[PDB]
């Protein structure tokens, strides 16, 4: 339980993977060339978690970049931190997946998957003690969705005792007009229920609504959407990246957050909500970080947590502040809104406090909730799915690559089971 291997698949995967590395690099004082130039030494204590070391004591991310077209990766390599990544860890094809899960999971992706696993293996042998893997990808396209879930199924086979973690971007019509995304997403969910231990449900419906309503951005861009993801990803992995006591590795986090093997779909929240233009001169009070991080407006998943019950909650606070006051406000929410926490898991809210704050803020709060209300997300997709599948629409793209209707029916069926299971424990 020391090193983590990071992977990013497809357009969304690589864009947010890149932004994630941009962010934490700045937090750990690593420059684009990989040298360290930071003040505090908290920055280098658990640096070995996400980075490798080299000659000249340069720091190289433990990251594998995957795609079926060269596009986003060429752009990432000439991105800001582009030259930071291990050149050999760029593994791309040319055919593309055409937003097709079948192309990603069964044909065009199968043609490439072996080559990726080779770079995974090479990184996993450099590991003194491997925890597992975090993947970043969208569920709506083809590469990240289809090839991504394939890589998991394959990686679980070589490393079944390791932990499988994902940052999975759920599709929304509010952001994409590709009609088949509900197909791609349902197929992916079936995989994720079975083969991940933890999945952060990053909803593009939420991210768009947040950008448009709260941050008052009338023409939200991907960079705007990703700034929110970047912030969440920094916060959620903070308890992993700096010295801490709670949820300090992926296995422990899983054990605290996952009461049942299938229900591992986490609802992230964050505060204060920030746009890249927003000034944020006035740091928030500890009571303000708390009322917000539990506020639906700050949820990245687009569910109403008041419609379900928290099975478990992690809450991570960053920056210099009164750890005394953190506990009172945290204990306040639990005691105020006690009906929204399940009674049969005592003290299901756990809290950590890291001193180093995120780039550009003095005070930040990140939320990780295993709410049953997450079903609303899966219910949403389920409806967008059936709307088409009842008329067997657009299936020819998939059957043409070798799939069968039955394989859809089972992924439809397995996700409906998921929803019902999240509803079984909401009335307990």
């Amino acid at each position: 339980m020391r090193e983590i291997v990071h992977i990013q698949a497809g357009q969304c995967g690589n864009q947010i993977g890149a932004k994630f590395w941009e962010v934490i690099s700045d937090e750990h004082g690593i420059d684009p060339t990989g040298s360290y130039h930071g003040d505090s030494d908290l920055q280098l204590e658990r640096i070995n978690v996400y980075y490798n070391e080299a000659t000249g004591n340069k720091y190289v991310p433990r990251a594998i970049l995957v795609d079926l077209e060269p596009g986003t990766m060429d752009s990432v390599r000439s991105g800001p931190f582009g030259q930071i990544f291990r050149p050999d860890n760029f593994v791309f094809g040319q055919s593309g997946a055409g937003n097709n899960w079948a192309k990603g999971h069964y044909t065009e992706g199968a043609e490439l998957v072996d080559s990726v696993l080779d770079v995974v293996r090479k990184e996993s042998e450099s590991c003194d003690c491997l925890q597992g893997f975090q993947l970043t990808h969208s569920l709506g396209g083809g590469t990240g969705s289809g090839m991504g879930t394939l890589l998991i199924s394959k990686i679980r086979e070589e490393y079944p005792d390791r932990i499988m973690n994902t940052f999975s971007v759920m599709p929304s019509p509010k952001v994409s007009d590709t009609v088949v995304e509900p197909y791609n997403a349902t197929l992916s969910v079936h995989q994720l229920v079975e083969n991940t231990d933890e999945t952060y449900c990053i909803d593009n419906e939420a991210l768009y609504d947040i950008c448009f309503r709260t941050l008052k951005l009338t023409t939200p861009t991907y960079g705007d959407l990703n700034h929110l993801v970047s912030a969440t990803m920094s916060g959620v992995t903070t308890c992993l990246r700096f010295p801490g006591q709670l949820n300090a590795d992926l296995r422990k986090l899983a054990v605290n957050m996952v009461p049942f093997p299938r229900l591992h779909f986490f609802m992230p929240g964050f505060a204060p909500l920030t746009s890249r233009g927003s000034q944020q001169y006035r740091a928030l009070t500890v009571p303000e970080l708390t009322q917000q991080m539990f506020d639906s407006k700050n949820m990245m998943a687009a569910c109403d947590p008041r419609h379900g019950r928290y099975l478990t909650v992690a809450a991570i606070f960053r920056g210099r502040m009164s750890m005394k006051e953190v506990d009172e406000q945290m204990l306040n929410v639990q005691n105020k809104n006690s009906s929204y926490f399940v009674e049969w898991i005592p003290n299901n809210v756990k809290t950590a406090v890291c001193d180093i704050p995120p780039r550009g803020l003095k005070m930040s709060a990140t939320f990780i909730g295993n709410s049953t209300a997450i079903q609303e997300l899966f219910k949403r997709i389920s409806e967008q799915f059936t709307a088409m599948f009842r008329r067997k629409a657009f299936l020819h793209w998939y059957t043409g690559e070798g799939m069968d209707e039955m394989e859809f029916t089972e992924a439809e069926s397995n996700m409906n089971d998921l929803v019902s299971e999240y509803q079984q424990y909401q009335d307990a």
């Binding site: 864009q15 932004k19 752009s75 509010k174 952001v175 994409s176 007009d177 593009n204 768009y208 023409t219 939200p220 861009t221 991907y222 960079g223 959407l225 990703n226």
Partner: peptide, 5 residues
């Protein structure tokens, strides 16, 4: 909806 990083 038209949405570029």
């Amino acid at each position: 909806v038209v949405x570029x990083f």
